[PDB]
């Protein structure tokens, strides 16, 4: 399955919120590239044949195992929306 | 290899010709062989003599007498071989000898007029219509005549119906209303029957003397004496009851149209309505119907007996004389001959109206052949009946059994006005008279269950859709060889024994004998028996009579097994089943698939394509072979020679194999070693595990031929030329296209390779191998405008058809099945080393999951497996009748002999009992299978008697704990059409009206996603998934283009706009006077469109 | 089978009442119960005027309850577009995009599942960009 | 509520598109609009020139019936196409209403692009979160994914060269198969049974490349689908968007849906064969 | 049943991944031991118990007196038919009991008996047909034939008996072929009527509830007995308590979802005889405008945890209603 | 930008129709067989529905025409519905 799906159901009230947040996370991971990660130093996804899971074999698992750490914060209205919604799509 | 038969029953008669129904029907319909002078008139000659002799007494140029003399037809324009190579109809033109007479002088006789072309039936029983061949299935419906049915509401009374044919004809209904009313509605308006009774000239005194003497319900008609003294003015009043507005001075307008010929049925004398009449009521019905026109007055022989006997039934009781709607004695089968005759007479009546009009507008007289008869109406009627009718269906030439069963298949539905798909649950069930006439198992599962059926093997239609079952006459206690074919109504009067009753030869050996009094299983003494069943085979169909152990199988599983037997593809090296029933030779003989020696003689030459045989008369005859003939379903029909040069043959002896025959035996499938034990998971629920042994030697291998076609036609831009040249690029791949446009024969082809090079306006539109699979090109046919005898679709200059053959071998995707319905799919093909094997080195072929046996009820396959086990060592085949097979002691003794042979061969090599076998024996001893205290010799023998032998795993080497049943079973590979083929596509052609993706010939096309899948997808929280799968992936052209471009660019797909589905919806509401705009939170409109709604 | 589903369908089966004592509209008309819930709340309590909209609960089959709906998209897609569209056209019918069939026809985000406005939008940001934007926040609070 | 100016549909909603040889297949809306325009122009010139009163009434009736036919066909007579083709014309009501109309055709969406179907076989060597996918349909289903991923490496210079190289199976290479297994390392596909009687008739799975023709299915879902192995077929869909991939992998993945929604009973319960085996091992 | 309980308990106490891994390993070992253990079906495995033979004789003897009882005119057709039906349906059960007693006593490891005892395949009726007798066979009119089927598939059926069983085969086939589409149409109706229900909510202040009974109001004309465990489970499992209840020294607070253990405890308490009805929140009393609230809806899902806010419970409700209709 | 919440369906004034449409169509000439381009002001005219070449063709999906009938007409639905809207 996926790492700690029960844990993932732990910190979110509704599973649909979980789906939204993880997929949106994958969306920035695509748009800025996988440089904007918060698990860089030691614990990265580890591919079998090589270290291919360093860059981008699957963004959804990247976002999920990003969420298991405490470095991800989500909310209904956490940031003034307009600034980052116009700065996200333009780079 | 010997064959041993088990059944102890003497078949007093053999199977009648399995396809005789269609052959006899059509040969009676077409009397071409007999001279036209012969008395035989029913069929097409009946239609001619009935309608065509138009007479005109006085209308303008009176004296018009167009009479019929003879008819003839003797030469098809082309042989049926070209008729299949070139898409013609295997037909013969019809000529009629007609002649014209006037009241004045003149006898203008035209001997030969071509009036339509009528198709001719082939030897087997099919018809070739346009290239392909079809079969016209027999139909079952109400037998014409007189029936009495209880009132749907009123329980005390009932109604009578006299039902002639055609539907555009009489339909008489008699009913009794207690106030003294005998109501009779003719077509749509009810009418007091007493007026019509007076019309026929019956007066009151003899009516009371001969009818009202016994019954007190005579007051139901004797009450109406006010208008029963009117001989002829009754005719005027009755015609006034009709409302045509015409003057009443038409004595024989509608009063006589129910006379001799026009309206009332011409049901065959004696039976078709008279047997339904004369035995049902009265004594005999002289003539064809009720009529009198020799004196202007009217006479009948029907209405008086009908009213008398109805009054007897409603008052007293002559008998339980209520006719069941589904009783088979009151149902009648229209064969292909009857359907063809009816369509022919419809077309002939159309021609009669046309010629009447032509005469009415005709001025002079010497115009008999041309200005009178035109072939267009009758030809069109015949062609439409043989092309687009419901009962003329594509022949299923998958194997001889399929074609034979299709030829002997009876349908309850048909043109539509008889019975249709929606609701038929009342009639789908079988009846007590189906015993020996209709197989209660042949019905196909699905919507058409019970409606479509097949008749019994011993069943025979006599002359009028009335199936007769054979029966042996029993006199006292001796069973006589005399055989009588009996009808249902005749059958319901005697006591019928059963074929399995013990017999002393010519004497019944039982005290209590089972019987059917009237469709009711009872027990009687031998002295009260009159008739005996000929054979159990008569109670089931041909396709059912092929199942060996039917007595130990379930009805549903028998149904599906018999259905899969029909769709078994023939194999390259097929072989007859180890356990057979005894009908395989009859099936291969009666279905014209093999070649037989018509007379005693010696073979002269045997080649791969023809056999020249010199008979004893000194005449040598050459038999060609359809070496590789594509079937309707795409299989292959081959005749393999079975004789050697200079070999003596006997009369009726085999010459060459059929498509699926070993040596005069129906062989569609293989005999394999099957072990019934659950393997790891690869036989989970119904799946099947097979060795590579069946693949290392080609053992389940078949030939499949696909027929591609392409047209070059004349367009407004210009003609399309099929040329070797390719316009733009392909020249390196053109090397395969050796000749002009067509690919060279014998060249292997892959999907996506050019096959026919056709050029348009220069634009390349070339037929290519479809994505998927391709084999070896074998044949190419080109038909151009230079027509020798061929025709083309208008505007098409030429056509080419290409046949590609490929050798399908058994693989994972395929499915297999036995004769007992145990469907399966090959789930894994194991190597030979890791399959279970006997103590001897021989490994088993196929592994079957036991759990499928108790869930269903098919113990027949277990007995078959035991008998196949015995046969594998004894090296012999067995024949067992379905309900007179081998008892358990017999197969036990055979297994004992087989074990004797097997273990004696084991000991001859100098070996005892393996240690693995010793511990397995001890384990089985703890399980109670084998009696304790015995040596491994007799313990293992007793284990063999159970049909179980020790097996070794082959992967571990350790024996399988507990014994396993193993044996030889007959398994056939089922017809494998596009059903498995991967309709898997990504991007292909899209539809034109809407942008839904749909392919077909070019690409497979998408998958149904319907509404139930929408509901299931949206039961989950799936939101964007449904949005993409309904708009991005299905409808939005720019959305799917952008998605494709983005995924090529490796980016997330863009969001859809307010989707073009809803923008189309808004613009469609905009098209009418409507007003649709999307609103924000407050009452201020939000423009869906960017700036496109604003003008300028 | 659990009883939640049967209870759900039975509730949807009897969501209709027909008023008997007229209020601000005709009397012999029946539709959604919650509409008179709100209307009685307004008439008696939210606004002045003690006019009791005395209703009786109407029990109609699955078919009739499906047919009579406040939204006209589902009704048009259900049985007959002509009559339904005519009725919805006589009066300006502001069809609320409540219900799932309607949003299927609209092709927009389905209200259920992920498309619920409760979870439809949910800002997500990683921790380091959170520190960056929060530093921008506290420096935006000047002095 | 009676209309004075009649709106005219945009052309692409009712296009006359060529089929073959210059002939154009047309929506009947164009024919009805042409008829109405002809009638209106006749009325215009008639009123312009002169007013024969009976003729004016007749042509007023003609225009009114033409407008009637345009708005909808069938209610007053049966206006038809050019004589010889007795097929009634298709009107605005026909496009909107009907079993196959604007409302009833978006509600089903009978066709989907990335889909396939095949016969299914037991997949006992696979785990419950996996499904066996034949290599050929796996290759073709993810075709744009394959193109992009092998463009990431130097297998082909551009996408067009990739399409031309993959257009024939004689040029397949093991590098292509490595790219394939790279593509679908985290992707999932939706398996679907034709009669979808409940929610579990759609189930996500992780594809595993296999050699063969049939789709290998985990035996334990043999009852979630009402699918035996008597040869009946089952279909596969591939969602593209990463958002939809998240949806399928989170809430439609079969490893997460082990209990019924109809009750608390499990649907991934051990099936017949496993039950028999474990009964045999734990019997005294 | 033990496997199902095991899986459910593991799901409750471990979660998602562990239950999946347990299922994987359990299936793998079940396959391996089913292979190596060697379960096979032969014609001798369908053992025929001998004692049933004298049973038949007694039944036969009884028929004679009944026939004689009908010969003296003491019986009418309807009551004679009822007596014969009762006798045959009683002796069939007697033979089945004898068959199972024989299989217990003599052959614990018989393949038919092992798959009957376990949940693999088959029913006692199917095993009786295989080994005992498929006595009563129904007529096309809907009644049942007077003459039963004495033989089994271990033995050979007479021609007449197979012809008779064809009637029931055809009946079942047609019934399936129609009820499939009929149930699909029913599901269509349900989804059309209930497609508006979606759980979007703050907990509605519903001071209302439904009292789910714990005793059958009428199992006899006037008597109370605790409902069948399955019924109470389907009425209470996954609900929300309307108000606090304390029944056996345990304080079930108001607003607490009834888990499986709570349902069992309530059933045991009702067995002791403390309470007879449970007040629970329900959709029937929810005050949510378009949908139901989480509290009023409940706790049952694909998981066990309380329902997430925002799922179309109406569609899944319709599907759960309609899916079993096909095999009904 | 704002989410769609209500869809209002209503009747149309003649002034509403005139504001909605961009020009009037008055020839019965969609497209000639010779001139594959729109022939004249007919049902497919170029300048009234937007260009057929590459705004996109979606104006020819969105922009609509109109016909100014000299004689008024009534919608068939409001005269033929089972409750005749004019008749009621
Ligand atoms: Mg199946
Ligand atoms: Zn609530």
Residue numbers in the entry:
A (entry chain K): 2 to 92
B (entry chain I): 1 to 761, 785 to 1119
C (entry chain J): 1363 to 1505
D (entry chain J): 512 to 795
E (entry chain J): 909 to 1236
F (entry chain J): 2 to 55, 81 to 114
Source paper text:
Transcription termination is an essential step in transcription by RNA polymerase (RNAP) and crucial for gene regulation. For many bacterial genes, transcription termination is mediated by the adenosine triphosphate–dependent RNA translocase/helicase Rho, which causes RNA/DNA dissociation from the RNAP elongation complex (EC). Rho is an adenosine triphosphate (ATP)–dependent RNA translocase/helicase with 5′ → 3′ directionality. Rho forms a ring-shaped homo-hexameric complex, mediated by the CTD.
Cryo-EM maps of Rho, apo RNAP, EC, and type 1 and type 2 complexes are shown. When the apo RNAP structure is superimposed with the Rho-engaged EC structure, the opened clamp in apo RNAP fits with the bottom parts of the Rho hexamer without severe steric clash (protomers E and F).
